[PDB]
Each structure stands twice: as structure tokens, then as C-alpha cells.
């Protein structure tokens, strides 16, 4: 064979060039940095009203409005200051794993096993919330809807591919292929020109939203990657897998930066998020808890101990004043 | 109170939304959630049609004042089982496999690993599983084709229709690793009338009664 040999030798030489030039891991340089102590975060508000397993949650751009998706087919918009339910949206599909807040606060796009991203308009003229546009074209379950603009959103699926849409037309503008497993999560960059997606093939990769190239690939996990999110400066990202490990990769180094695993940790990470400064890497785990790792030292510098079930979703306000954690115990808790 | 004239109306709207949420959750908790599972080419488009009537396929029907929601599996193509944990707390699992399953070629490996997967999952081990063998048009004409040594070397004895069915049910009982909590409901009928719906209704009635008894501490 020739092409298989060519691919193997290209992979080997890229890996050799990557190793021979890499100086030292993130910990080797950042060990001199003092720790942050223990992040003791207390539940200031508990949001009640969801009557099923809570799977998704996304903060508003004003750091006061929240959207939460539960199993009973409910997408609730909360006022995070007074626990006032601003809105309650009965979803068409009760099996939702993701949904987000539009950056202008006008729309919410949400979906799951239906393979359809349904987008509802909030600032209407009739005082209710109506379905604006349903994006279809995926052949597998949906994940990590993330608005780019009011007419443009990227969604991941289990088709080993991601899609960039155009809401007015409703047609799939761009398709990013190259994964070899169920893609579980994507995060949008702060500059809204690149993104990353991690799949069940224990690999993540950085994709260009404009021209649709497979810009970079990233491996190092042993099992399915369930969550992913950028560093707030859009030059790095973190994944959480079923290997009971979080891994920080860098978008310019082309391999793993460092790892956030512990011996006592046996269950996988299902949600991941960053604080506003990119110092506290918060991970909602499978057992019961949320661990506040120091994204520089990989130390368990805080545990959010509520949530009698598994913490399924995390969120940080755009101002960073609070952390929303949602679990299968049918409750969000807002922590500060 | 300290609330302004507008925040009082906002609180009133939020309380009305609370009222609607609990009112609809009362109906949502009074609905029977059934998962539907099966191996490749096992047959799922023949029992959902018997019910009283893309990604996930939802079938809704009311039987004897019970609202059943059934969630199908034939709309997915990825078998990574990342969506099974979404089906925790369902009433029961209707799993479908046919006696003619070793025609597409072997019935042991893929089907029995699917069973052991749903019998090993932490989320499903406390949920009862319903087993169906419905039709009676081809389950007899391929037993007498040849001795099963070609793909079933575990048994080398007498083989009639009833004996083979009983042996398959017994080996299924052997597949169940823990009978302390989960209960298997196998069914051997004719796919001719609405007996499958009555059987699943009785199975869910019994499992709900047993959950009630465990909740009361009587079981």
C-alpha cells in the first residue's frame, strides 16, 4: 500500500516534530504560581419549578436572565435576581440536551434527540413566545446550539459533523466533517470566527466557521468527550471525558496543555465551564458534585456540595457574578 | 411589602407560571413512559402499528385511562448509547427480538450483548424489561430447517416449537444477572389482535404497584 503508508508516515513525522519542539507542560512553568485557596461558594438562589431531569442551561448576555431545559419539555426563562419566572416555553420535543441565549436576548435555540434546533422569539408583539425557525438537516441527536448572530448559529450532532446555519433561509450554509464518532459538544469562540468540537472518538478539533476547513485536531483522551468550552480569550479550550479527566488543549500548541484528573475521581465529566477571568475551571461531574479546579494547577480548589443528583450543566454569567448549576434532581442552584 | 407596584405584578405573573407548571406536571407525572429497544432487523414497525393510534419517534396513546408515551429506537444510527441515561425513570423497556434473528447472519452475539448491556446499565437495572415474540407465521417453519449446531452449539437435544421457545426463555432467564430488583416479562402470543397492548398495560400496572409498595415500605 502507498496511501496508508503516506498517512502513517505523515502522522508519525508530525508527532515527532510536535514532541521535539515542545518545551515543557503547563504545570512545569506554572508551578511557581500560588494557589487560590478553597473556593467556598454558597447557594444564594435555588430555582424551583422544573419537574424532571434538567439537561441544559445558558446564561443571558445581561447576566440576569437564564434559560433552562428540562426533561418534561420545558424551557424556563428565569430572572436570576428575584427568582421570578419571566417565561415558560413548552417545547415540542421533551428530549433536549442543549440550548442557549441569543446574544441580543431576542431568541432561544434549543434541541436534542429530535435532530431539530427549534428557535423561539421572545421580544414579539403579542406578549407570548412563538417558534421562529426550526433548523433541520442532522441525522443524529443534537448538542451545543450556540448563536453567532440573530440569523446565524452553529450546532453539533452525532453525525460526526457540525453545521453552520442561516436562520432567515433555514438552509445549512456550511458543513464541517471529519470526526469519527458522536460529537457531543461545541463552544463558540469570543471572536465568533472559529470553534471547537469534541466527539466520542476521544478527539476534539478546531474548525473554521467561515471557509469550513478542519483547521486543527486534538487527541489524548481514552473515551467519549462530553463537554467542551473555550478559554475566554479564544486561544485555548478544555474538554471533559468519561475517563474521569478534564484536559486543557491549546489552539496554537496543537496538543494537550495539561490534565485535571484525580485518583479518587472515578466518574466522568458531563459539563465544563470557565470563570470570567479564566482562572477557575468548573466541571459538573457524574457522581453528585461540581468541582472547581484551578485551570492552572489542576487542584480541586472548591466543591459545590448541593444537588442530590448528578450535576448535568454549568453556566457562568458574562459578568461572572454567579454560577448556575443544573442537575437531574430537577433544580438549578445559583452560587456565589 | 417593599415591592414596587410593577414588581408585585411580576411576582403575580411568576406565581401564575408556577401554578401552570405544577398543573401540567401533575399530568406529566400521570403518564407512562415506555422505552422501545431492539436489535437490527428485529421488528419494531409491527407492534407500534398495533398501538391505538428524523431522530426520536414518539408514539402517544391512551389505554384504559393511562396515557402511554413510547419512544422508538429506529430513528437513530449511532449506537454509542449516549442517550440511554436520558431514559432513566421510565416505567419499562419493551425490547424486541425475533426467533428468526439468526437468518440475517448469528443470533447469540449482537442480540445477547444488547440484552447484557441493558441488563448491566446502572440506570436500567432497576427498571423492568418487557420481552416480546409476537408473530406466529415464521417462528415454526425455520426451527425444523436443520440442527442448530451451525450457530447454536449450546443445545443439541430434541427440538419442537414449544421446546425451543421454552429453552430460549430459560437462557434469557440465565442472561439476567440480578433478579433481586428487575423483573422480566416474556410474551409468547400471536400478533393478531390487541394482546400486546394488554400485556404491556398489565406489566406497567404491576411494576407501578410494586413501586408504590416499595414507596410505602411494604416491599
Amino acid at each position: 500500500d502507498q496511501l496508508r503508508q503516506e498517512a502513517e508516515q505523515l502522522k508519525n513525522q508530525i508527532r515527532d516534530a510536535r514532541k521535539a519542539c515542545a518545551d515543557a507542560t503547563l504545570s512545569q512553568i506554572t508551578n511557581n504560581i500560588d494557589p487560590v485557596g478553597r473556593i467556598q461558594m454558597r447557594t444564594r438562589r435555588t430555582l424551583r419549578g422544573h419537574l424532571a431531569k434538567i439537561y441544559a442551561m445558558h446564561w443571558g448576555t445581561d447576566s440576569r436572565l437564564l434559560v433552562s431545559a428540562s426533561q418534561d419539555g420545558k424551557l424556563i426563562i428565569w430572572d436570576s435576581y428575584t427568582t421570578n419566572k419571566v417565561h415558560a416555553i413548552p417545547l415540542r420535543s421533551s428530549w433536549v440536551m442543549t440550548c442557549a441565549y441569543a446574544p441580543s436576548g431576542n431568541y432561544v435555540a434549543c434541541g436534542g434527540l429530535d435532530n431539530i434546533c427549534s428557535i423561539y422569539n421572545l421580544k414579539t408583539r403579542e406578549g407570548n413566545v412563538r417558534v421562529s425557525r426550526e433548523l433541520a438537516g442532522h441525522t443524529g441527536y443534537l448538542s451545543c446550539c450556540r448563536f453567532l448572530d440573530d440569523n446565524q448559529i452553529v450546532t453539533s450532532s452525532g453525525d460526526t459533523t457540525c453545521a453552520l446555519w442561516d436562520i432567515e433561509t433555514g438552509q445549512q450554509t456550511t458543513t464541517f466533517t471529519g470526526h469519527t464518532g458522536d460529537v457531543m459538544s461545541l463552544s463558540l469562540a469570543p471572536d465568533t470566527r472559529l470553534f471547537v468540537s469534541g466527539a466520542c472518538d476521544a478527539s476534539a478539533k478546531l474548525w473554521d466557521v467561515r471557509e469550513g476547513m478542519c483547521r486543527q485536531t486534538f487527541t489524548g483522551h481514552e473515551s467519549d468527550i462530553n463537554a467542551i468550552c473555550f478559554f475566554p480569550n479564544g486561544n485555548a479550550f478544555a474538554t471533559g471525558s468519561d475517563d474521569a479527566t478534564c484536559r486543557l488543549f491549546d489552539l496554537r500548541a496543537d496538543q494537550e496543555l495539561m490534565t485535571y484528573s484525580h485518583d479518587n475521581i472515578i466518574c466522568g465529566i458531563t459539563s465544563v465551564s470557565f470563570s470570567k477571568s479564566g482562572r477557575l475551571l468548573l466541571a459538573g461531574y457524574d457522581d453528585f458534585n461540581c468541582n472547581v479546579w484551578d485551570a492552572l494547577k489542576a487542584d480541586r480548589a472548591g466543591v459545590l456540595a448541593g444537588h442530590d443528583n448528578r450535576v448535568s450543566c454549568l453556566g457562568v454569567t458574562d459578568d461572572g457574578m454567579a454560577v448556575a448549576t443544573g442537575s437531574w434532581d430537577s433544580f438549578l442552584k445559583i452560587w456565589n | 411589602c417593599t415591592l414596587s407596584a410593577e414588581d408585585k405584578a411580576a411576582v403575580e405573573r411568576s406565581k401564575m407560571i408556577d401554578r401552570n407548571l405544577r398543573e401540567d406536571g401533575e399530568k406529566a407525572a400521570r403518564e407512562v413512559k415506555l422505552l422501545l429497544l431492539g436489535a437490527g432487523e428485529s421488528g419494531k414497525s409491527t407492534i407500534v402499528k398495533q398501538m391505538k393510534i428524523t431522530g426520536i419517534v414518539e408514539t402517544h396513546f391512551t389505554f384504559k385511562d393511562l396515557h402511554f408515551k413510547m419512544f422508538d429506537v429506529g430513528g437513530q444510527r449511532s449506537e454509542r448509547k449516549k442517550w440511554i441515561h436520558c431514559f432513566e425513570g421510565v416505567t419499562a423497556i419493551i425490547f424486541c427480538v425475533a426467533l428468526s434473528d439468526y437468518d440475517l447472519v448469528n443470533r447469540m452475539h449482537e442480540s445477547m450483548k444488547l440484552f447484557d448491556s441493558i441488563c448491566n446499565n446502572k440506570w436500567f437495572t432497576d427498571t423492568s424489561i418487557i420481552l416480546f415474540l409476537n408473530k406466529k407465521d415464521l417462528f415454526e417453519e425455520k426451527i425444523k430447517k436443520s440442527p442448530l449446531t451451525i450457530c447454536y452449539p449450546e443445545y443439541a437435544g430434541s427440538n419442537t416449537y414449544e421446546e425451543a421457545a421454552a429453552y430460549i426463555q430459560c437462557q434469557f432467564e440465565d442472561l439476567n444477572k440480578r433478579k433481586d430488583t428487575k423483573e422480566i416479562y416474556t410474551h409468547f402470543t400471536c400478533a393478531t389482535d390487541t394482546k400486546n397492548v394488554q400485556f404491556v398495560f398489565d406489566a406497567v400496572t404491576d411494576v407501578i404497584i410494586k413501586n408504590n409498595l416499595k414507596d410505602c415500605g411494604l416491599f
Epitope: 430572572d79 406578549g127 | 414596587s4 407596584a5 410593577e6 405584578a9 403575580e12
Partner: single-chain antibody, 232 residues
């Protein structure tokens, strides 16, 4: 969105009347409803309010105990029943919708109004002028003052700026302090502090003339201003 009123006419003193408000074009069951009145060539005056679901009902202390409010959400109708009418009940009656949550516009739409004729503590809002001549293209600043500070502890300022064109019904221009309405040109703006509030208009247009009103919500009963009429 269309609110239409009916039930007006001429009535003898001591009689009882009923006004009906029918809505079509929005979610009536999710909107609280206000009944407002305007005395002939004198000014606006709030009359009554009913919350969503008929939970909270408020009346104006001037005619408190004499009027009553009824509501039908499944039929989308708002009723105002009047028991005994003096020589003051003659007025032009308006029906207003009001939804209340974080960030809403609770006075956006007004009704068409109906005429009623009869045969023969509270916050006070002060409006500086009543007739101002001006030509198009000139920026106009209107000012009005309040008794107490509209600034609540939340940070919200409960001031509503409405415009009434001649022959038309009032329309919201600003709902809390400086927040533009839906479908209104973006040349209007509002600013001020505490008790002194100004509405500024840049690049004045021909159809912008009319009577401007500033009202406080903040509390009950709701009170309107005198009314500043722009001349041209």
C-alpha cells in the same frame, strides 16, 4: 393589536352604564388591563386597573367604591360598570394593556376610546407649560416634575411619556425613563433625575405635534399630568 371600546352615550344623572373593551391581536389573558379617562379639553385621568388573572384590582380614590371592573379572558373582554354618575363622569374613556415582567413595556398600546356624557397622599405631577409654538426642524425639550422620587430601590424609574395627536388616541413614547417603544422613531429621548424629567425631541416632524403627557406608575392610584400641547 387592536383594542376597541364601546358603550358611550348620553345618560341622566344617577343612572348606571357599562363600557366594554374588546381586544384582538395579542395575548389578552397575559395582559393586565387599565381603564383611563380624559376630561373634555382638560387632561387624562386614570380610573381603574385589573391584574392578570383578575387577582389584583385597583380603583382611583376619587371614584373608589362607585365603579366596578369585570374581566373575561376566555372571551377577551374588559368591562367597566358605572353605578351613579355626577356631572364629572362625562369624559373620553380609553382602554390600555399592561404586561409586567423584567424588561417589558407595560403601556405600549392604547384603545380608541368612547364618549360618555352626563346631563346637568397621591403623587402630584406638575407640567411647566400648556402651549408652546414651534416650527419643524427645531429640537424641543419638555419638562415635568413629580412630588416624590420615582427612583425605586431596584433602579427603575416609573415614568411614562405618551403622545396624543389631535383626533387620535394616546400612544406610548417612553415607558420607564429613557426606553424607546416599539415602532416609534428613535428621535425621541428621555432623561432627568429624581423628580425633574425632560423629554427631548430632535429633528421635529410635522405629525409629531400634539399633547404630551407624563405619568408616574410607582404606586396607586395612577396620576397623569396637566398636558403640554405643542403648537405649529
Amino acid at each position: 393589536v387592536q383594542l376597541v371600546e364601546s358603550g358611550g352615550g348620553l345618560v341622566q344623572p344617577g343612572g348606571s352604564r357599562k363600557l366594554s373593551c374588546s381586544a384582538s391581536g395579542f395575548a389578552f389573558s397575559s395582559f393586565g388591563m387599565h381603564w383611563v379617562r380624559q376630561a373634555p379639553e382638560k387632561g387624562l385621568e386614570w380610573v381603574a386597573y385589573i391584574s392578570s388573572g383578575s387577582g389584583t384590582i385597583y380603583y382611583a380614590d376619587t371614584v373608589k367604591g362607585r365603579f366596578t371592573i369585570s374581566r373575561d379572558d376566555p372571551k377577551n373582554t374588559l368591562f367597566l360598570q358605572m353605578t351613579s354618575l355626577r356631572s364629572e363622569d362625562t369624559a373620553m374613556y380609553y382602554c390600555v394593556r399592561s404586561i409586567y415582567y423584567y424588561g417589558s413595556s407595560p403601556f405600549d398600546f392604547w384603545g380608541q376610546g368612547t364618549t360618555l356624557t352626563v346631563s346637568s397622599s397621591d403623587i402630584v405631577m406638575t407640567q411647566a407649560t400648556s402651549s408652546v409654538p414651534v416650527t419643524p426642524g427645531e429640537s424641543v425639550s419638555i419638562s415635568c416634575r413629580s412630588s416624590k422620587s420615582l427612583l425605586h430601590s431596584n433602579g427603575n424609574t416609573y415614568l411614562y411619556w405618551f403622545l396624543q395627536r389631535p383626533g387620535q388616541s394616546p400612544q406610548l413614547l417612553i415607558y420607564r425613563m429613557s426606553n424607546l417603544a416599539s415602532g416609534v422613531p428613535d428621535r425621541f429621548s428621555g432623561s432627568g433625575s429624581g423628580t425633574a424629567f425632560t423629554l427631548t425631541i430632535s429633528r421635529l416632524e410635522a405629525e409629531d405635534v400634539g399633547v404630551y403627557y407624563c405619568m408616574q406608575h410607582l404606586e396607586y392610584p395612577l396620576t397623569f399630568g396637566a398636558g403640554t400641547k405643542l403648537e405649529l
